[PDB]
Amino acid sequence: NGYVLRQPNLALYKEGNYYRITSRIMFEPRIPTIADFVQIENCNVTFV
Amino acid sequence: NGYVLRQPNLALYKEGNYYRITSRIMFEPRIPTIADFVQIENCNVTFV
Numbered sequence: 001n002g003y004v005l006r007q008p009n010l011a012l013y014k015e016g017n018y019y020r021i022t023s024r025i026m027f028e029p030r031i032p033t034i035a036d037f038v039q040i041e042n043c044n045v046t047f048v
Numbered sequence: 049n050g051y052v053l054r055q056p057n058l059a060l061y062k063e064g065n066y067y068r069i070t071s072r073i074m075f076e077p078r079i080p081t082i083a084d085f086v087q088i089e090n091c092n093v094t095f096v
């Protein structure tokens with residue numbers, strides 16, 4: 001299983017050791033959580 | 049409690065033994081999860 005985001009306007013990034021997901025239009029950062037993801041069986045290697 | 053979807057553009061269906069929820073505008077299928085539902089007390093019999 002590979003996970004993706006529920007809507008496009010967000011984007012992950014590696015801020016430091018931890019990972020932070022920000023908006024695409026502003027630099028405001030938001031905490032990661034499990035509710036923000038969605039499941040798809042086929043894994044693409046190109047992801048984290 | 050009866051559950052419904054967080055936004056209208058989705059739709060459940062019984063693909064096989066398991067249930068799959070797809071987009072209303074494309075046939076792309078997405079995995080079921082609990083985060084995609086919402087609770088309402090009154091149960092309508094007309095649902096699954």
Ligand SMILES: *[C@@H]1O[C@H](CO)[C@@H](O)[C@H](O)[C@H]1NC(C)=O
Binds near residue numbers: 044045046
């Ligand atoms: C999936 O990974 C392949 C690896 O070669 C990459 O070329 C492709 O762009 C990726 N597709 C995506 C991320 O949708």
Ligand SMILES: *[C@@H]1O[C@H](CO)[C@@H](O)[C@H](O)[C@H]1NC(C)=O
Binds near residue numbers: 092093
């Ligand atoms: C609720 O179920 C009743 C069962 O008679 C049905 O007639 C009605 O259309 C349903 N309402 C919904 C699904 O909003």
